[PDB]
Each structure stands twice: as structure tokens, then as C-alpha cells.
Design a protein around this ligand. Structure first.
Ligand SMILES: N[C@H]1COc2ccccc21
Lengths: 237, 300
């Protein structure tokens, strides 16, 4: 059924699973027309498809041309997401295909279920977790590849960098969600924390800085503080 | 006009014949039902006074044979049987009529209710939904499950309604996933009408039969089938105009006939609100929407 705090360790067992987040597939800026009406202009988007155990991110870039001449785009975006996830599953060797796909928003269930009828053994599940995957576009290198795409493209990342050499996938996921929650609540401050110290850099082949274990503890503490600070600024506490 | 005689009434029972119901007391001198209109299927149904568990009954057509009811004290129910000896049967019926031991199918002359509820129901199609080929009549009861219910247990005692499942490969063409899920016209017109039912009359016959089994037996799987066949039409953007007009008439008389006090269990709020107010056909069911709104405005 649904995924929540009671079965959280299931994410890191040895059954292949993917989270699918569609919140950055259909992106727009809203603006005034010369006539004083309002219009939208789409920008490039992306499907965020993540293996939480391995960190393997399948970033399908959604180029604005896919919306050309189409109606009901927010509805179409869910079906396009499901189309692309289904295509990805079919492209993977049988032994790499997921046993479960967890969608971060319930409106993806029926589109994905319909597109995966050929895979009756793959469980399509919602989750009660509020996951911050919308903030994926606050990761500079992911945002960059999306905005530069001139055509549909799939780009593969490891969203954990090399962290699994030193920590478990439970801890890596906890770090990721804390970083993304911080970037979602106050992007400017979160990025300031991540780059304040010029001596710690992001390797060319990585997404996040090359923090030592002790430095990650400090960073993690600063991100918690930020989320609490913002919680206080928001609610006046 | 035809007759279904009863050997006797050894147990107290509420008897129904189509939309009419009457009570018979234990060992009351009762020997059946006369003046049954020829030209329609009929259903004779039972609810024991001492155990309202299991409404059960028999669908039949008097043009196909001479049928009677006889209580079986071993199996504990009123059973329909066929009498092959026609002169024997005629003589039995004539004696019971002379002794005035039979109630009369109370059809008002103006009243087209039963025709309107059974317009497309045909015994031969009933006998393919209810498989028991040695008899010309068909037994249904409260508890019988459908072929689809079993998939999700005895197959001989099943209601073999046509399986409708909106999230199935049958309903969804590869590469038209969104199209076919949001507009079921392919599934209605090509898969079901052209493919399975052959014409809208057979589709409507099964829809009407499902409703009647839901209403008269409280058969839950029949209620599911009735709602599924309505939703499949309402969720199709492209439906022949004559089918929409006929569906409106069919539903109108079903809603008109439904006991007010059973509306809570026989009507699916989600399906009806979708069909009347959100679906492609939301504007095509004028008669049904008007009676629904005046009779069950709470459900909406
Ligand atoms: N209770 C009335 C209403 O319908 C019938 C049918 C047969 C005998 C009696 C009645």
C-alpha cells in the first residue's frame, strides 16, 4: 500500500525500487501580455526518478517542445511522466527493473498504473512521507543540465556522490532529504552554508562538496538550524 | 396470460413477482400466481419469514415451458420445476383456478413499468450469465458472486457478467494510455459493443438484468456490474445518440422503481455524481438527472 514512517527501512532493503517525483515536469513563468492579460511560458522540466538504495538518479529532461500545441498541460504532464517511467523500466534489463515504484504525489498513481499494465508484478505505491524532491532544481548541476537542453534527454547521476563508501544508504538518504528540505525552505541560505568555505569544492564528477565526515556533521547541524530558524521566522516562534 | 402454480406453501414466505410483493402464511392454502403477462421475462422471488437471509428466485419466460414451484423440505427452499406433461399441467392449473387458490399478477393497464425495466432482457442471455443448462429457468440469490468478484469461489454458482475493468489491457490500447483512460469510447464501442455484446440491445439487456438482480436480491456483484456499465457509457465521449437517449429512459425507470429506503445501499454516490455532473454525458441524461435530483438529492 502506501509508504510511511512505519516501513521506512523498506527503502534500503535489496528489492529494487524507484521514487518518482513529477513536481518539476511542467514548469512555467506567469506574465502579463501586451493587452494586459496573463499568459504562461513553459520552461524546461525534468522527471526525478531515484533509487534510494543506490543513489542512481534517472533525470529525464522534459523539453518545452513536448507541450507544443497540447491542451490541459498539468494533466498531460502526469501522463507524460508515466510514459517516460514506463519507457525507462522497459529499457532496463529484467534484473534491473524495479519491484516497486513509489510516487511522491497521489495523482501519479492512475497514470503510472495504466502505463505499467504490462508489468503486473511491479507495485505502484503512494507515500505518506513529504519528500523534498521538488528542490532538485536547487542543485546547480541538475538545474544547469535541464535549462541547457535543446531536446529531450536522459541524464544519469548518483545523487549521493561517493557517500556510500563511508555511510549506509539509510544515512545517505537522510542527508539528502535534509539538504533538499533546507534548499526548499531557504535556498539562498542553504547554498551559502554549502559553499561558504572556498577550500571545500565540488568534484567535477559530483553534485555536492567534498566534505569530510566531521565537516558533514557541521553542515548537517547548520541545515537543521536553518530549517528551525525558518520555521521560527515563518510562524513567529 | 400464463400461470405458475405452487404445489403448496409449507413455510411462511414473502413472495415477489417482478416489482410486486405479497405475504403467504405457513401452510396457507396458496397454489400460485395467474394472469402473468406473456411477452416478457419474469422473476419470482422469495424471502423466508423465519430467515430473511438469502433472498432467492427464478428468472423464467412462460413461452419456453410450463413451470411450477414446489417446496423442498430437504434443501429448504421453494424450487422451480418444469412440467413436461402439458395436459397434466393444464388440468392442475384449471382446478386451482376454479378453486380460486391463486393470486393475480396485479398489472394496471396504464403501467409500463415492467416492460420498461426489462425492455432488452432476453431469457437466452440470462441463461448465459446464469449457467445451469438442464433447466429453462435461472436461479439467482443474494449471495452469488460474479466471475469478476471471484478473480479478485465455486464457478458453477457464479454470475457470468461481462468483465469490465477500466485499468486492464482490454480497456487500454498500448500507446493510447491517457486517451483511452480519460475517454473510454474505444472500450465501449470497439471492445464491448462491436467485440463482445455485438449490439447495444445486448449491452442494455445485461445492464437491466444486473440492476434487477441488485434490487430484488440485494446481490452486491450485480450492483457493481450495473454501475460499471453506466459509468462506461458516461465516461465515453463518443456514444451513438440513440444509445444515450435509451440509457436515459432505462435509468429513469430503474431510479423510479428503486425502493426509497434501499437507496443508501443500491446507489454508488461516486458513480452517480461523476455520471451526472462531471462525465462527458453529464448533459445527456435529462430524465435521469431530474428524477435523481428530486428523489435522492442527498446522494448528490
Ligand atoms: N400485495 C399485493 C401487491 O402485489 C400483489 C401481488 C399478488 C398478490 C397481492 C399483491
Amino acid at each position: 500500500g502506501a509508504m510511511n514512517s512505519s516501513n521506512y527501512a523498506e527503502l534500503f532493503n535489496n528489492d529494487i525500487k524507484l521514487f518518482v517525483d513529477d513536481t518539476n515536469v511542467y514548469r512555467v513563468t506567469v506574465h502579463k501580455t501586451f493587452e494586459g492579460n496573463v499568459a504562461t511560458k513553459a520552461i524546461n522540466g525534468c522527471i526525478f526518478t531515484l533509487n534510494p538504495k543506490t543513489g542512481h538518479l534517472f533525470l529525464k529532461i522534459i523539453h518545452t517542445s513536448v507541450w507544443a500545441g497540447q491542451k490541459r498541460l498539468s494533466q498531460l504532464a502526469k501522463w507524460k511522466t508515466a510514459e517516460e517511467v514506463s519507457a525507462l523500466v522497459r529499457s532496463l534489463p529484467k534484473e534491473e527493473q524495479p519491484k516497486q515504484i513509489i510516487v511522491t504525489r497521489k495523482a501519479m498513481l492512475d497514470p503510472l498504473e495504466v502505463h505499467m499494465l504490462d508489468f503486473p508484478n511491479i507495485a505502484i505505491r503512494p507515500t505518506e512521507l513529504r519528500l523534498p524532491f521538488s528542490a532538485a532544481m536547487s542543485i546547480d548541476k541538475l538545474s544547469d543540465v535541464v535549462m541547457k537542453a535543446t531536446e529531450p534527454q536522459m541524464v544519469l547521476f548518483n545523487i549521493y556522490d561517493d557517500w556510500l563508501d563511508r555511510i549506509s544508504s539509510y544515512t545517505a538518504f537522510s542527508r539528502l532529504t535534509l539538504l533538499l528540505r533546507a534548499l526548499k525552505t531557504n535556498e539562498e541560505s542553504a547554498k551559502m552554508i554549502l559553499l561558504s568555505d572556498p577550500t571545500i569544492t565540488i568534484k567535477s564528477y559530483h553534485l555536492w562538496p567534498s566534505f569530510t565526515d566531521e565537516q558533514w556533521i557541521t553542515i548537517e547541524s547548520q541545515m537543521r538550524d536553518l530549517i528551525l530558524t525558518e520555521y521560527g521566522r515563518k510562524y513567529n516562534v | 396470460m400464463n400461470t405458475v402454480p405452487f404445489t403448496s406453501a409449507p413455510i411462511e414466505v414473502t413472495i415477489g413477482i417482478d416489482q410486486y410483493s405479497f405475504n403467504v402464511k405457513e401452510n396457507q392454502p396458496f397454489h400460485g400466481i395467474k394472469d402473468i403477462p406473456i411477452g416478457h421475462v419474469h422473476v419470482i422471488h422469495f424471502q423466508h419469514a423465519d430467515n430473511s437471509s438469502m433472498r432467492y428466485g427464478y428468472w423464467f419466460d412462460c413461452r419456453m415451458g410450463n413451470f411450477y414451484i414446489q417446496y423442498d423440505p430437504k434443501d429448504g427452499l421453494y424450487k422451480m420445476m418444469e412440467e413436461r406433461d402439458g395436459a397434466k399441467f393444464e388440468n392442475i392449473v384449471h382446478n386451482f383456478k376454479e378453486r380460486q387458490m391463486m393470486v393475480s399478477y396485479p398489472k394496471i393497464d396504464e403501467d409500463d413499468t415492467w416492460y420498461n425495466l426489462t425492455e432488452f432482457v432476453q431469457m437466452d442471455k440470462i441463461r448465459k450469465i446464469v449457467r445451469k443448462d438442464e433447466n429453462q429457468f435461472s436461479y439467482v440469490d443474494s449471495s452469488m458472486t460474479t466471475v469478476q468478484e471471484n478473480e479478485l469461489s465455486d464457478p458453477a454458482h457464479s454470475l457470468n457478467y461481462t468483465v469490465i475493468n477500466f485499468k486492464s489491457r482490454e480497456a487500454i490500447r498500448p500507446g493510447h494510455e491517457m486517451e483511452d483512460f480519460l475517454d473510454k469510447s474505444y472500450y465501449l464501442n470497439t471492445v464491448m459493443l462491436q467485440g463482445i455484446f455485438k449490439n447495444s440491445s445486448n449491452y442494455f439487456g445485461e445492464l437491466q438484468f444486473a440492476f434487477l438482480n441488485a434490487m430484488f436480491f440485494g446481490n452486491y456483484g450485480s450492483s457493481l456490474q450495473w454501475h460499471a456499465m453506466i459509468e462506461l457509457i458516461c465516461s465515453s465521449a463518443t456514444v451513438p445518440k440513440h444509445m444515450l437517449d435509451k440509457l436515459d429512459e432505462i435509468l429513469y425507470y430503474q431510479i423510479k422503481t428503486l425502493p426509497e429506503q434501499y437507496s443508501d445501499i443500491l446507489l454508488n454516490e461516486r458513480v452517480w455524481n461523476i455520471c451526472l455532473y462531471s462525465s462527458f454525458q453529464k448533459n445527456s441524461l435529462h430524465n435521469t438527472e431530474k428524477i435523481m435530483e428530486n428523489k435522492y438529492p442527498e446522494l448528490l
